[PDB]
Paper text:
Proteins that perform these functions include Vipp1/IM30 in photosynthetic plastids, PspA in bacteria, and ESCRT-III in eukaryotes. Here, using a combination of evolutionary and structural analyses, we show that these protein families are homologous and share a common ancient evolutionary origin that likely predates the last universal common ancestor. Rings have an inner lumen that is able to bind and deform membranes.
Rungs are maximally constricted at the top and bottom with internal lumen diameters of 14 nm and 15.7 nm, and widest at the ring equator between rungs 3 and 4 with an internal diameter of 17.5 nm. This unique asymmetric curvature is a feature of all Vipp1C11–C17 ring symmetries. The analysis of different ring symmetries, ranging from C11–C17, provides us with a view of the structural flexibility that enables Vipp1, PspA, and ESCRT-III family members to perform their functions. Furthermore, as each ring comprises between 5–7 rungs stacked together to build a dome-shaped architecture, these asymmetric structures provide us with a glimpse of the structural features that enable filament tilt in the context of an ESCRT-III-like polymer. Based on the Vipp1C11–C17 models, where helix α5C is positioned at the tip of the spike, α6 helices likely coat the ring outside surface and do not contribute directly to polymer formation.
Author numbering:
A (entry chain F): 105 to 155
B (entry chain AC): 1 to 155
Write the structure that this text describes.
Amino acid sequence: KASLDTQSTQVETLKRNLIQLESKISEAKTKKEMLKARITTAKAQEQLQGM
Amino acid sequence: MGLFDRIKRVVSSNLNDLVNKAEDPEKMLEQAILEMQEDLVQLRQGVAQAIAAQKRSEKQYNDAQNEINKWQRNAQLALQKGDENLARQALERKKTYTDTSAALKASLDTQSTQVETLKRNLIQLESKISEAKTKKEMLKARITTAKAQEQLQGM
């Protein structure tokens, strides 16, 4: 029972860690999205040259 | 000295030759436009991905809220039980979860603001391509006038 309780506590922590990890990837994606927005501005400058 | 001097003469000739080969109004605009179109599609996909990512975060946030509610019920049960340790553990669990939920909500709000900006940017980008098309249309009209002059020669 003691081992099970410890195991139960451990799995819950892992699940919480997994959720945190999942949150971290979303944050990275958000950072990537900001970078993508910057790329569009560079593309716009190129478009002006074409005109 | 002349080696450096030789490069300058060569560079001017090389630069002039290179620009002339690629100096096509339609080709230059098209290449940039194609890249822009691809970028726009990628941006739209990214926005869709961001929305999907945001939805996943919301689901996680919803689960956390449900967990807090479950914890609250347990805390109430602990008080009825009269065990101090059980009640204390529940309170600690509620506080960390609440902080996490608040952080998630703040992140979600920021994400929501960011996706909206991207959507607005995409709309602006879409407007920009239309403007380019309008410019191209004006150029096309000019071409017809040139064709008319050629037609007169044929007569």
